[PDB]
Each structure stands twice: as C-alpha cells, then as structure tokens.
Symmetry: C3
Subunit: 222 residues, 3 copies
Amino acid sequence: TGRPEWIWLALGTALMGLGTLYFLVKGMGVSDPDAKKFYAITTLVPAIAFTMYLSMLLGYGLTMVPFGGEQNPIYWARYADWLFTTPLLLLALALLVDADQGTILALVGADGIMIGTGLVGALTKVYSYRFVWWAISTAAMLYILYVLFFGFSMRPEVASTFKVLRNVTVVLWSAYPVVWLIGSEGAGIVPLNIETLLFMVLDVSAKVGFGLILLRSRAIFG
Amino acid sequence: TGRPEWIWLALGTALMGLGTLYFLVKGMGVSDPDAKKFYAITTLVPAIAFTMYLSMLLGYGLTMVPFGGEQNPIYWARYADWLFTTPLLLLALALLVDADQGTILALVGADGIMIGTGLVGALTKVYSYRFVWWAISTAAMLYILYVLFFGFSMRPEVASTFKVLRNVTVVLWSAYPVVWLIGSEGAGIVPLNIETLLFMVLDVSAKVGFGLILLRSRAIFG
Amino acid sequence: TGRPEWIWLALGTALMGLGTLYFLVKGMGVSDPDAKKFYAITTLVPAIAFTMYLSMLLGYGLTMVPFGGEQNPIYWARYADWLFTTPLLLLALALLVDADQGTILALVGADGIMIGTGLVGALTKVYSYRFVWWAISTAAMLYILYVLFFGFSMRPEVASTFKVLRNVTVVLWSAYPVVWLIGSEGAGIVPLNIETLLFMVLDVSAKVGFGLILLRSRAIFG
Ligand SMILES: CC(C)CCCCCCCCCCCC[C@@H](C)CCCCCCCC(C)C
Ligand SMILES: CC(C)CCCCCCCCCCCC[C@@H](C)CCCCCCCC(C)C
Ligand SMILES: CC(C)CCCCCCCCCCCC[C@@H](C)CCCCCCCC(C)C
Ligand SMILES: *C/C=C(C)/C=C/C=C(C)/C=C/C1=C(C)CCCC1(C)C
Ligand SMILES: *C/C=C(C)/C=C/C=C(C)/C=C/C1=C(C)CCCC1(C)C
Ligand SMILES: *C/C=C(C)/C=C/C=C(C)/C=C/C1=C(C)CCCC1(C)C
C-alpha cells in the first residue's frame, strides 16, 4: 500500500505468525504442568502480536492524532499488543524464579501502568504533555527492571536461564522508550518507516527470540 | 422501538435477568468452596449478559460501520459480553476436570484472541478483510474445541458432567461463527432481526441452559 | 486552567502521587510473602489513581456527553481508575479473611459490573436511561457490601482490622452513588466543581487513608 512502513508490518506479521506455529507444534506432547505454563505463554505472545501486527498492516490499528499542528499517524494497536504480551513475558520470568505472588502483582500492575500511560501519551493532543506521560511510563519501566534485577536456593538451571533472559529483557525493553522518544510519537527525529522497522526488530527478538531462548532450557520443566 | 430486532433483545434481556436471579437465589447457602466457584461463574455469566443485552436494547451497544457502500448496524456490545463470559464458561469446564494452569491460560488466551479478532472483523470497514478476521477467530475457536476434546482418574461424576457440558459447548459455540458469517456482520444473507434472534437463542442456551445442566451435577461439590 | 474543578484535580493528583511514593518507600525491605501482597495492592491503588487524576487534570480523561439538550463534561477517567482499583481494594479485604476463591471471583465480577454499568450510565445520551444504569450499578454495590458484611476462627488481629476496614468501605463506597446521583452525571443538583471536590475527598480517603489503616495492622503479616 501507500505506507512505506507496510513492508515492516507485513514482515512482522509474517514473523510472528511463523513463530506462533513453530511454538504450537513444539509444544505438542508436553505433559509437564510447569512446562505447559511456559509453552502457553511462549505461544500466546507471538499469537497476539501477529493479530496486532496484522491489524496494523491492514490499517485498522492506526489512527491520526493532531499535534504540533500536524496530523500524525499513530499505531495504537501496539499498545493493545503490549498490554497483554508484556505482563505475560514478565510472568515467564516470575514463574522461573518462583516469584512470590505479591511481587508478580506488583510487576503486572507496574506493567499495565507502563503501557497504559504510554498509550495515553501516544494519543495526547498537547505536544508537551506527551512527554509527561512518556516519563511516567519510563518510571514504571525502571521500577520493573529494578525488581527484575534486585527483587530476585533456586536450581542453577533456573538462575542460569533467568540471568540470560533477564539480560535480554533489560536490553531490549529499555530500547522501546528511546524509539518512542526519537520516533513519530515523540520528537519525530526518526521517520515512521524507520521507527516501525525498529519496533519490528525489537518485537520479534523480544517475542520470538526470547521464547526460543526460554524454550531451550530444562529450567522450564519440573 | 423502530428496530425489528428489539423484541429479541428485550426477550434476551428478560431471560438473562431471570436466570441471574434464579442462580443467585439457588446459590444461597452454598458453603462448599468448590461449589462456590461454579455458582459464582454460573451467576456472573448471565449477569454480564443481562447488562450487555440491556445496552443493546437501549441502543447504547450499537454502532454503524460503513462497508459495501452501506451503513451497517453492528451490535458491538456482544463482544464486550463474550470477552468476559466465554473465558468464564471455559473456566467452569477446566475446574471440572481440574485442568492444569498452563492449559487454562492457553484456553483463556485463545478465547480472548477469538473474541478480540471477531470484534475487529466486526468493526472493519474493508469488506474482504472482515472475513480474514473471521477466519483467524475461527482458527482460535477450533483450537479451543481441540483442547476441550483432546487435552482432556477423574470422578465418574466429573467426566459424566464434562462430556455433556463439552458436547453442549462444541455444538452451540460452533454455530456462532456460522451466524456471523451468514448474518449482517458478514455476507448479509440473513437479516439483522433473524440474526439477533439466533444469537439470543444461542446465548440463553449457552448461558442459562449450560448453567442449569452444570448446577445439577454433584460434580461441582467437593 | 479555565475549569474551576482543576484545583481539586491538581490536589488529588498531588495527594495520590505523594501517597504512592510514601507506600513505595514503606514497602522497602518487606520480605513476608503475605505482607508483600498488601504492600503491592496498597501502592498500586494510589499509583493508578495518580495517573487517572493526572489525565483528568490535563484534560485527557474528559469528554462531552449530550443530554437534556446540553453538552455535559464527563470525566470518564474515573471509571478507568475504579475499574482496577476497586477490585484491588476488595482483594485486600478478601486476603485478610482468607476468602474462598469463589467468593473473590464473585466480588471482582460484581465490582466490574458495578463500574462498567456506571460508565455506561455516565456516557448514555438518553437522560432517563442514565438512571437505569445507575440503579443496576447500585444493585451491584449492595451485593458487594452484602457479601462483605454477611459472607464474612480467624486471628483476632485479622477480624479486628477487617471490621475497621469493612466499616470504612461501606461508609465511603456508599457515598459514591449519591455523589453521582446528585452530581453532573445525574440530576445535576451539585455543580461539577463541588462534585469533583467530593470525589477527591472520597478517593484519597478510600485509597490513601484505607492503605494507611491497612498498613498499620500486624494482620497483614504471616
Ligand atoms: C526454529 C527457530 C530457531 C526459529 C524459527 C522461527 C522463525 C521465525 C523468526 C525468528 C526470528 C528471530 C531470531 C531471534 C531474534 C532476532 C535477533 C531476530 C530479529 C528479526 C529480524 C530478522 C531475523 C531473520 C529471520 C528469522 C527471517
Ligand atoms: C428453574 C430452571 C429450570 C430455569 C428457570 C430460569 C428461566 C429463564 C430462561 C431459561 C431458558 C433456557 C432453557 C434451556 C435452553 C434453551 C434451549 C432455551 C432457548 C431460549 C428460548 C426460549 C426458551 C423458553 C423459556 C424458558 C421462556
Ligand atoms: C505518613 C501518613 C500518615 C500519610 C502521609 C501521606 C500523604 C498524603 C495524603 C494523605 C491523606 C489522607 C488522610 C486520611 C483520609 C482523609 C480523611 C483525607 C481526605 C483528603 C483531604 C485533605 C487531607 C489533608 C492532607 C493529608 C493534605
Ligand atoms: C513484545 C513487546 C514488548 C516486550 C514491549 C515493551 C515495550 C516497552 C517496555 C514500552 C515502554 C514505553 C515506555 C517506557 C515509555 C513510553 C512509551 C512506551 C510505551 C514505548
Ligand atoms: C455466551 C456466548 C458465547 C458462549 C459465545 C461464543 C461466541 C463464539 C464462540 C464466537 C466466535 C466467533 C468466531 C469463531 C468467528 C468470528 C466471529 C465470532 C466472534 C462470532
Ligand atoms: C478508589 C475509588 C473507589 C473506592 C470507588 C468506589 C466507587 C463506587 C463504589 C461506585 C459506584 C457507582 C454506583 C454504585 C452507582 C453508579 C455510579 C457509580 C459508578 C459512581
């Protein structure tokens, strides 16, 4: 279509789709109750992303927000995606270390605050206020990274896989606020097709690569 | 009012209302923790449906979507309903067989994908794309029916009630994609008043009849 | 700004903000798994409220609804807030008395029905129907108060704290339907700046004061 970023959305659609099917087939036969939690999470995440990538590709998950006296194309469907996939990803890490329920509730809650404020900043028509929402969202992310790092006699397999998955998370999630900031939702320093490209690379690595690393460890089994 | 289907919405409103009160009174006195889960679910489902049937009757849960160069009346409130009641119904079956948590998460996740994609197809302005969303939703339903059928030393009361409730589910839920397809959200082969009528009969049977069958078995008690 | 109620929104924003940070710092060091559930809840609630109070202050959580041949300013962001904070508050009480899961599901479900119908009444363009939604919401609240009162060998610390927190709840929550009824969402007998003021006093007491009382008892620890 006439949207330069269409190619990255089609590509993202394809990659999330293939990853979903891949995890689906791989989870076939799993009977371990613990492993079943990781397969479910690991398959559900790209499955949701696929649908949200498809609605962006078809034009449904897109809206125009006026600001800076311009009509800016905002892909709201990413928040619909993140709203469910990021807490699911956080659950995988938490089941991993057998996190206390209070901690999980804190993470999920901070995460929803994180995505919900980013969405409000994304749709805000007063330019300066967009960055206020961006800051609160960022504060929520730092909270989460903090607990991932400092809130966590576990099996050496568990820790070993956790450290890896936790380093992956901190590095890939921290990039999202930067893309947003430099991208069309914020300062507009990077054009929307490049921004969509960056998010597509982060999403697939945060979702497919994360699940491949996760589904490789024996830490997921009881 | 001037909407021929008003009668089925009023009737559905009434039936969900009466069923709610019926289950409410019947659940009075229940102290068994397990039974309390089924009563809660069984009462909550028609309670939600009542509210969504009432907003359709009053005109709130209705919106016009343009497609095929026409202005089509779409009852979005059904998805608001289904979004919560279908996973609750799936929970009753899963508690029944004492399903593993990983399986429940898979079912709820597929279910949300199922209703969320159907809603997007319902609101999509490009005619052909409506059917793409319809197909993905259908694929999610088949997944669910698959696990209900093939993902499931349980008490003979449990199995016995499960088989019945599971046959009911497969038969009534499979009809929804067909109604949508033939109805005003899809090919428009069946007029909206007939479609609302069909959904009302499915909803009450899927909700009230399902709960009557459920609340009759001793399988729900510990 | 040009909205007389801005001062109460700024003030509410400030108070929820300060309470969040206060609970955050106080929860530092907590290792008891049970206590962690109460701190998380107690911090998450004002944290969400802060964000919703800020979007009201900035004008984002506000919309005009026509009715009575007038264009009425409706703060929809309060429902976005309540939708998550009221079930969380109900969870604190339920963990307190160690409520059965079936009961919790009933409370959360009734609560969502309560806030969701109030939101629909809030956005309804037919004046008389607003009060129908108001009534169903009120019926859902009475249900909840009923179970809090009559659905509940617990530690004397637990009961003692529960009675207090339960008396607080019944008294503050029962005021919300009255404010709405007399306020701009209903009969319009009280102007919007006074209504916002009343809700701000209820919100801070229902959220910050409730959490201070809660976080004072040894009932929250194992
Ligand atoms: C069987 C396994 C290994 C995987 C097959 C699933 C296929 C789907 C795509 C998986 C891609 C992700 C690899 C890990 C993370 C990233 C660094 C990839 C970023 C995305 C961009 C291009 C990647 C190349 C290709 C996989 C086409
Ligand atoms: C005490 C029990 C048995 C039930 C009383 C609750 C009353 C409310 C309506 C219950 C209806 C559902 C019966 C099971 C399923 C269906 C096949 C019914 C489809 C709906 C259409 C008309 C049904 C007739 C009537 C119940 C008015
Ligand atoms: C360390 C403790 C005690 C608390 C400090 C947190 C500060 C934030 C505000 C807390 C206010 C709530 C007190 C309990 C409930 C209410 C009756 C208060 C209603 C709100 C209106 C004004 C209150 C005064 C002030 C706290 C500024
Ligand atoms: C599958 C996708 C993932 C893992 C998404 C992570 C997205 C983030 C961590 C988002 C963070 C944001 C903020 C911290 C600042 C405001 C903007 C956001 C929403 C991009
Ligand atoms: C209480 C109502 C119930 C039990 C609803 C079930 C509804 C379905 C199983 C819906 C399925 C759909 C698809 C499979 C295709 C697309 C359209 C839908 C949303 C009707
Ligand atoms: C943190 C805020 C809290 C504790 C909110 C409680 C709000 C209520 C109990 C709301 C009730 C309502 C009804 C009973 C009637 C209709 C209007 C509402 C939504 C205000």
